[PDB]
Amino acid sequence: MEMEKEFEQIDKSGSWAAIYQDIRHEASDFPSRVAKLPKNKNRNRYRDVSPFDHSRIKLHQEDNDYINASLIKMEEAQRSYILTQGPLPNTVGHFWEMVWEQKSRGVVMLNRVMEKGSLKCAQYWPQKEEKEMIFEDTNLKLTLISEDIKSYYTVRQLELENLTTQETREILHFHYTTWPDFGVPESPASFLNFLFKVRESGSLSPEHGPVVVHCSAGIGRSGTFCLADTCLLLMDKRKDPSSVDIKKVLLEMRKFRMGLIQTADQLRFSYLAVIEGAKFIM
Ligand SMILES: CN1CC[C@@H](c2ccc(F)cc2)[C@H](CO)C1
Secondary structure (H helix, E strand, O other), rough: OOOHHHHHHHHHHHHHHHHHHHHHHHOOOOOOOOOHHHHHHHHHOOOOOOOOHHHEEEEEOOOOOOOEEEEEEEOOOOEEEEEEEOOOOOOHHHHHHHHHEEEEEEEEEEEEEEEEEEEEOOOOOOOOOOOOOOOOOOOOEEEEEEEEEEEOOOEEEEEEEEEEEEEEEEEEEEEEEEOOOOOOOOHOOOOHHHHHHHOOOOOOOOEOOOEEEOOOOOOOOOHHHHHHHHHHHHHOOOOOOOOHHHHHHHHHOOOOOOOOOOOHHHHHHHHHHHHHHHHHHH
16 A cells, blocks of 8 residues: 555544554564673673674674664665664764764764763763863764754764874764654654755765664664654655655664664654655655
């Protein structure tokens, strides 16, 4: 079926939970043996969210190459994304090592450091120009260059320096600051505006390594971001945009990381975002 009318048909019939449970039943199951090794317990935020072995990002290190991060490679859309958990106190250096080694331009953050009164990820970037951060375990230096605070999101320019080689690179930090503590946003308008700002920066384009996207577990809000981006790109590329099947795209993405889209409300919000976004593109 088309999307907008499949949408109204699920609303009128109130069957979002049944649709979402079908997706969960059909989703791929691949091994994640490296994630579960005892030496990696303090590298995982949640025991039930792990990268598959076949698609995990490897750190360029001979001691321990493990990080909770997955490469989502979308062949028809010609887009790639790295989806990862929010960094932990003992993985902030690994996080920036990955950004460096994978040649990423942009980092997309969809959570606040504190939500619901608890810490959802480490304070992994500097908050003042004159107070830079040094990660001694991976030999990197990170400096805040500029910060632009808007009503729904903040954009930061950061300098990452590899202290071994003295090479430097400019990294863009795109921080969506207004996702509610509970539920999903009422309108997709500010989320779509944010996605378009990331696109306009070059961070999603083939001349750079894959964008790094995270929330707390790296599967819920993060899944909504890449699912909406890929579906809108396919609607631009194909002769028949109504052929784009968001459930099929989501199942394809779940071949590369488990659990993408965590609730039926997130599924409905993803439909809403693609539907509204397709009208603005034209
Ligand atoms: C966590 N999950 C359990 C089932 C496993 C599996 C094994 C054999 C198969 F034919 C199909 C699935 C999967 C890969 O090992 C990991």
